[PDB]
Structures are given as structure tokens and as C-alpha cells.
From a paper:
The H. pylori RNA degradosome is composed of RNase J, a 77.6 kDa enzyme that possesses both 5′−3′ exoribonuclease and endoribonuclease activities, and RhpA, a DEAD-box RNA helicase, with a molecular weight of 55.8 kDa2,7. The central importance of RNase J in post-transcriptional regulation in H. pylori and its participation in an RNase J-based degradosome prompted us to investigate the structure, oligomeric state and post-translational regulation of the H. pylori RNase J. Here, we report the crystal and cryo-EM structures of H. pylori RNase J that assembles in tetramers organized as a dimer-of-dimers.
The crystal structure was solved at 2.75 Å by molecular replacement using the Streptomyces coelicolor homolog as a search model. An overlay of RNase J of H. pylori and of S. coelicolor, where an RNA substrate is bound, suggests that the path of the RNA to the active site cannot be the same for the two enzymes, and that the nucleic acid would need to be rerouted in the H. pylori enzyme. The obstructions are caused by exposed peptide loop regions that are positioned to accommodate the CTD.
Residue numbers in the entry:
A (entry chain A), B (entry chain A): 139 to 691
The structure:
Amino acid sequence: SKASVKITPLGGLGEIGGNMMVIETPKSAIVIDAGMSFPKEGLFGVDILIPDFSYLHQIKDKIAGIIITHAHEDHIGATPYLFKELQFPLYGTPLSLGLIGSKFDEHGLKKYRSYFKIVEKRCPISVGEFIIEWIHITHSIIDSSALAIQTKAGTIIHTGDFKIDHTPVDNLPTDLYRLAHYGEKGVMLLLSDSTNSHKSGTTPSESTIAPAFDTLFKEAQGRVIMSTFSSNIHRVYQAIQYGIKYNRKIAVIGRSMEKNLDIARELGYIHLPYQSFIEANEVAKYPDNEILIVTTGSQGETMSALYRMATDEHRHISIKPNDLVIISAKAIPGNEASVSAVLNFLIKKEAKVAYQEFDNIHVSGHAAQEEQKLMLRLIKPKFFLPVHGEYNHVARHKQTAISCGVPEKNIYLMEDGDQVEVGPAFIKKVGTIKSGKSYVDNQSNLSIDTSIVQQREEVASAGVFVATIFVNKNKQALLESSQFSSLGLVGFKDEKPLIKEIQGGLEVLLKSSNAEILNNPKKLEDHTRNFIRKALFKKFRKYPAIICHAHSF
Amino acid sequence: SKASVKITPLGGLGEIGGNMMVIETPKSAIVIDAGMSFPKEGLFGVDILIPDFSYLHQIKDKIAGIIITHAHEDHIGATPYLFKELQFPLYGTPLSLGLIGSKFDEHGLKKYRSYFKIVEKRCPISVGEFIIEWIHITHSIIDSSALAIQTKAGTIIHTGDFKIDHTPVDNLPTDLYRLAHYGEKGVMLLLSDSTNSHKSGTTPSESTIAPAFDTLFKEAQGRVIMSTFSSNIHRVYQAIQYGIKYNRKIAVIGRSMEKNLDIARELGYIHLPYQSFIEANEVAKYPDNEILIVTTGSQGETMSALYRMATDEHRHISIKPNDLVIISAKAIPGNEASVSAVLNFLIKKEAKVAYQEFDNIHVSGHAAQEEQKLMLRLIKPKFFLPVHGEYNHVARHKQTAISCGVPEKNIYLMEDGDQVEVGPAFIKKVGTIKSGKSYVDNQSNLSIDTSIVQQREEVASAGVFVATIFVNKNKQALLESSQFSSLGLVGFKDEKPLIKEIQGGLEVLLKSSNAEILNNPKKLEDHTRNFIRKALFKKFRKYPAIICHAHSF
């Protein structure tokens, strides 16, 4: 008869990013976050994946609202794509709603800005059968929040994405007293960031970058270029401040970066004088030591713009042999080779490059082991659910929690789809639902399921041999020459004559075929596809997609 | 009238691996190395690239021999593919020729073992107009050699791939006296490893792994699995030694690893007792704490076998919840995400994993800054050509050489294709030749040019809309229903009705077309492809490959 809650991860447990969780009691439910995950970044763009909203359709009538905790694409990137299907009230801080509404406007969903509900921190608010409080927490992004969620089964604490920065840039450190209060009163369950679970110590403060920026700007003798992604408002704000400190005119390239900076300037999060800024067309009018350019690309991209500038295909900015390029790309693990490619192209143009002191190692943004342990000691949860990471990350976080006196039996390692019931005296997995991903094109802004692309590559890897046969069923013979085309199987110079060698085979086969096969085009097409498949495998040791068409006209 | 040489990099300047250089005097030439480059590694295999041998056909009548310096796939992997086109005498140490002949036998080129010529170290040998001496040098692999190449223009020193290890595993440290002698006598040109140019200090000795192995084997309570690639004979030899130290029976999985180990055992490089080894089918007969398994996959692969064992699709070895898995994969930068995937699958099976102390950071294998500086001070070259790396690597190496008192004007940064003439008093680029790569399938063992694959993906990225039209030119109308198929453009559920919507369009178009278009199928096919292209772009914002076929029969 005792109460309980049901935690359903739809994204964030199996990948870094793409966070979406469902906290559900009987007759009520809330959804925490709707994020985008970036698995790879190359010279031509980034891969983007959004979660699958299939389960939300099943519990549509229990959802009391979407809870937004971070004003960043890894937590609000999927909201436009979700609101194309379902709509619920969106609780969030001003900047979070400001950047979500910007994307909504870009997507033609300005209508759903109607659903926005602003919240302030240190102010509990009733949403459904939940009492939610936003608690300020430090992180790399401009606005971050932990959640204190009171339910009749107990209080849940959701940190999710955080670091402990005692000297942040905005001088708004973590509201430590509230986190401790909830812990003294008693906490049933804690969900905590597991991204940086494998690193000991604490993560360095964002203020440890200020001296590096100051040194790089002090001794810069030409233009300064700052390459990053559209949602690094904090880093771009730190860089603009140091540009105006050394009397440099700022030129921001990229419509999304300027919008995001303007949304934050208007809402009062950042202070930026207009007179320090110029347009790209004006950069050539100023001497080189008075120029700071800030470059971004499409959503999540950093190095496509750098590659276009280093190849002279950008057509707005060209790399010059006195330039200093500061690279602050997204921490997409497995990006080193692409950074190396951009670096090669930039060194060819005789440009100095600073990239190490802005990598993921110097600032990780996510809580390291000491910060995770501080969270565990502040909250003192009875049950623990490590979130925001792959399986090995949350496993290491469970190890840390065990070292902090949390019983191993009170920690479950969730995977996307898993459903876990939590009560004031137990924790257990109760089942699985339909979880998945969907690829997203950052240029055309549409979602395509991972199944469609799996197939595109199930064939796009290996070639595709097309064929067309025209026979006269009443003569039982080829009527018009068979026609063929191929792609990706083998280079053309070896397929112009293999095309003639599979044509010969088929002409003979057809003349030698039973009239029934020739009379019914389907049997002929199946017969033909098998003939060709065997012929191509024997010649290439591949099994290309084979498409055949037969005619009897 | 003074002599000079001509250095033509065909591979190794723009990528890590795939090394092939041509040192050419008028009327004579030698080729140093024929390597394989591994740019990416995933859960299903590795990418393999070999250099383009086009220039070697032009200078075929000057080549006095192929010079092999390292017994490893990154220096001898392309030799079978090169010998399918041209043949020259192959100078090499026993193990180098032993592993090259093994691959030759696998490729059906045992005939060309006739071309082998064994060499010993500290023994100058005349090859063409060159006097070549192999000097022992330390490195991660079992046998490595620097080259001292006397020409009438001066003496060239080729280190290429090296580290300075004062306590190697074989107790055969670098022959430092010979390198110094050549330097005192005078050296015109030096080519040196630039792979690890960005790291300060010295690289740790291979003996710093022995305590880690000993600790891991001491406290292993179940089976021990050692996952690596077919050519890590040294690491697999270190691991087998520690397995027999703790009374574990060794089970080697992978035909290539056993062959390479047997080639080295017979030639006397390694000492391995037969009685310590067992077959895979026998591992279940022994208790878990008496079992060391060694796993490899295809050429260069490490984690495909691990993934198959962790998914229970291996069918010879299955991961058990007491296992300890030591990962020693190839240092292919940009592999972190794939290692993380394998790690997730292994932790799901409750297996302990050791991977950090066998990463690239703990042992780099390539000379760091102090070792590069030691080489520069030992050789004292007048001219310097940094090799074995991308552009930023060789640029950093040039910086180091400048700091070592080498004039900036005596250092050139080559790129694949560049031709550089070097004389006893000058250095300059004289032109460019045709350089390139070719992808290699590790299962079927054939080369496919990067052009063929570029195209496979120029279309395999985006979809491919096929179509067939049957018209009667004397009625000027569709005779039989048009037929269509698609792949990768959009999921099927949205293309079954778009296929009907492009069919309708075309039926009308055809009936409305000029008789000339209908009379000549080529014009009809071009007309049709353009119609469809516009229709598909408007619906998908994509430009899929479009293949059309028209019939008038």
C-alpha cells in the first residue's frame, strides 16, 4: 500500500547526451529533458541523434509537464522534434525557454511558446503529483539546475550534469545549502552525472582558462580566430571579454551564435557592448592586431567552418599567415583525427594554433570522482541511479558510490528502455519499453529513424548492381538488349566489361529458360537476381544489392 | 657537377603508417618500406590503406631493391600488393623476410620468396649506387633497424620509426656507437620519426609493463584474456611469459598470431615451450585460474574478436563473469568510442577489464622530444627531413630540430608526392608526382582505389531512386506500368506512397511528351531523371542517385 515511483530512461543511459527521463507515479508523470547526442564530428559536419518518443504517446494523459534543467543542446535539442508530435507545458528558467523558443521559431512551432512556464530557483512549484525545486548548480553552460522532486514516496534528487566550481565565471556558485538541507531531511533516490566517472580528483575551475586567454591575447601579433560551436555562450563570452580588453573589434560569424548571444544579452545573463562588434565584411578594414573573429557552423559543428576557412572555400574569412586560431570544439570522444586534419590544413597556411588548453582534459565540465563523492555525501541517498553516460561510466560511478557507503544492492545500472520502480524501501527493474534513436540532419532539420540509415549502409557498404530485361514471352527470347548499371561494387574500368559479361550470361539464360519463368515477370526477376548474385560473388567476393526489372511488353 | 639525390615520399608524410619512400640518384634507385596504414578501427573491423605504386612503374629500370627496416605491417603490409605488379630484390633481416614471405604465401606469391636477400646488421652492403648498413635500434616491435645509406653525394641516415629504450625486453639496446660514428664522419641528410613530436620527455621503457603484467596475473582469480592484433609479437610474448610464470595454459586464437609467433620461434627471436600451449577446444577442460587466452582478429583488428566474444557470437570463447580482459589494441587515434563500446559489452558480462596501462600514453613506441633531440645530436645532420607523420607532426619535429641548432632553411616539410633534391650544399623541392592510397579488404585481400569508394559514398550517403519506363513510341504513351525502387532516401513507410506519387507524375509527363523524346530512349531517360530529381528534391531536400531505364519494345 506504500507509494512508489517508476523511472524510465528514454535517453542518456548508453550515450553521452540525448538525455530524456520519465518519472512516473500512477496517474501522473513528468519528463526531465529532451536532448541531442553528438556521436561523431568530422571535417564536413557532425552526427546528431535524438531519442525515440514512442513511450510518451502511451503515457500522454499522465504527463504534467516537461522539466528543462540545462540551457544547452545536449538537454533541449530534441524539444522541437518532440513538439512536432506531442505538446505539454514546459517548465524552465528564462534562458532555457529563450533558447528553446528560438529553435521552436526556427522550426515553425512559435505557437508552442504558449506552453512555456518560467520558473525561479529556490522556489518549489507543484507540477502534477510532484513538488519540483530548481537548485542552482555550476557547470560549463550559462544556466544549470539540479532538481529536488518531492513525491509521496519520498524526495528524488536529480543532478544529472554538473561540476563543482567554487570560482565560476558568473560568480554564482552551487547552492550547496539547499542540497544539504534535502539530505538532512532525507532523500530516497539520487540520479547523478556519470560522464567523468573514470577521472580522480576535482575538475579545474572555469577561471583557470582566464590566464590562458589573457596570455594568448597579450602576445597575439595578428588576427585572433576563435572556433567553437553555436551553444558555447560562456566560452565565447570569455573570449569576447578578452578581445575587448585588448582593443580588438569582435566579428561573430554564424547566425545561431549571434542569436544565442543576443537571447542571453537581452535576458540579462551576459553584458556585451554593441560598439565592440563589427560585421565580417568589415574585418579587412581593420589592422590585423585589432580583430577577433568568432566562428561557428551548423548545430554542434566546430571544424567544418575551420576547414572551409583553411581551404579558402568559406568566402567570408580566409586564414592568413599571422593568424592565431583557438580551437574549442565539442568534446566528442574520438575526434582526435579530425582535429589533426584541421590542424594540418591550418599549419599549411602558416597559422599558429592553440587547441590543447581548450581540450576536454583541461576542463571536463562534468563532475570528477571527488565532486561525485561530494554530491553523494551532501545528499546521502538511500538508493542511487547513476545517469548521463554509457554502461562503463555508470558502473564506475556505482563503484564510487559503494566506496561512499551506499549498499551495492541499492544501486541499479539502467540502460535505455529499462523501467525501475523505486519505493522508500526497495528498488527493482520491472520491465522494458521501446527505446531508440533517430538521426537528425543539421541542414534540413528533419528526423530519420536509425533503421532507415542502417539499411542505407546495409547496401551503401558494398555496391548496388541494377539490371533490366525485356523479353517476348511468345518467342521465349530476349526482345531488346538487357540494360545494366552499377555503383560502388568495383571501379568502372573493371565493370564496363563485367557489365558485358553478366549481359551475355543473362541473354543465354533467358533463351534457355522455361516459358513459365518468362511468362511471369516476377519469377523472371527472382531468377535473374539469383543468377547475377552468384555471378557477382564469384567475381568480387561481395554481395551487392541487386535490383532487377523484367518486362514482357 | 656535384652529385645529389632525389627523395620521393609515396607514403608516410600525411598519415601515420603506410610508409614508402624512394631514394633516387640518376640511373639508380632504392625503395625504403612498403607499409599499411590503419585510419579507423570499429567493432566490425579496421580500415586499411596501402600506397599507390604508380611512380614505381616510371622508374622500374632504376630500382636496385626494396629495403625493409621493420618487421611489422606498418612497414611490410603493402609488399604483397606491390609484388602483384612489380618485382625487385628484397633486402631484409630474417624475421622481416619471414613475415613478408608468410604474407606472400597467403597471397600466392611464394614464387617471389626467390627475390629475398637476407642481411645482417653492422655490415655495409652494396645495392645499386648505394652502400646500405642496418643499425639495430629499439622500438616496440621484435626487430627494428635504422639505415646508414652512403651515396656519392653524402651519407643519409634513416631512423623512421624508433624509440630509445635502454632496458628493452630482448636486452638488445640501440647500437648507439654506429649512429655516432656516422655523425662524427659527417651526415648530409637525416630522416627521423615525427609521430610523437608533440610529447615532451622520453617514452617509458617496455620494461615498465612487466610489473603491471605481473600484478595483473598475480591477483587474477579466473581466466585471463589478452586481446590484441596479429603483429604484436612482443606484447603477446611478454604476456605468454607471465602466463607460464603463474602456471597458466596458453590458448592462442587466430591463425595469423600463431604463424607469426611460430616464424619468430623458429628463427630464434623468441623462446616458447610447446607444453605450455593448448587448443581452444581444451580451455573448458582446465580450471579458470589456469587459463590464458590470446585473441586476435583479421589483419590489424583487435576489438572485432572482443565484440564477438562479448556478444556470444564467437562460438569458440565466451566471456565469463570472473574473467579479466587485457586490451592492447593498435594505437589508431580516434578509437576511444569503439573501446568504450567493447568496454560496455564486457562490463555487462561482469568481467574486469584492464585497458589504461596498455594504451598509447603509457607506451607510445615512437620517439618523444628528448629521444628526437638525442637522435639529432648523435647524427648532427646538415639537412633534415622529418618523416612518419602528418603535417603538424613533422612541423613540430622541425621546430625541435630548429631548437637543436639546425637552420630553418635546411629543413623541408614534405607531403606525399613532393620530390626533394638534396645535395651536399642545398635542399629544394623540384616537383610533384602522382601519389595516392588504395583501400584494402582484410577478409578478401584485394585492393580498391580510394576513387571507387569515394563514389560508393558519393551516392551511398543520400539514397538511390531506380526507375523503369515502357512506352509505345507510335502511340506516344506509356505501354506498361512504370516500375520503381528506392534505397536509403527515406524509410519505406513514407516511400511506398511517394513511389506512387512519382509514378503518377511520370505517366502524365510521358503522355504529354513530344514524340521525339519518346522516339529516342536516351532523351527520355535524361528527361525522366531530371523530372524525378526535381520531384525528389522538393519532397526530401536530397539529391539521390537517379538511375532510369527506358524501353520502346
